[PDB]
């Protein structure tokens, strides 16, 4: 997980809660999901 603070990390974390993948939370709060481990600049947090 890679989001932009704790703002969207907080929100693609609550909308995966349910049973939405996290494409759908990370692109309505913004934060980016990657396949590895390591995450940009804009979205370190």
Do not use: M, Q
């Amino acid at each position: 997980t890679c989001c932009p603070s704790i703002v969207a990390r907080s929100n693609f974390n609550v909308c995966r809660l349910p049973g939405t993948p996290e494409a759908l939370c990370a692109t309505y709060t913004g934060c980016i999901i990657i396949p590895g481990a390591t995450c940009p600049g804009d979205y370190a947090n």
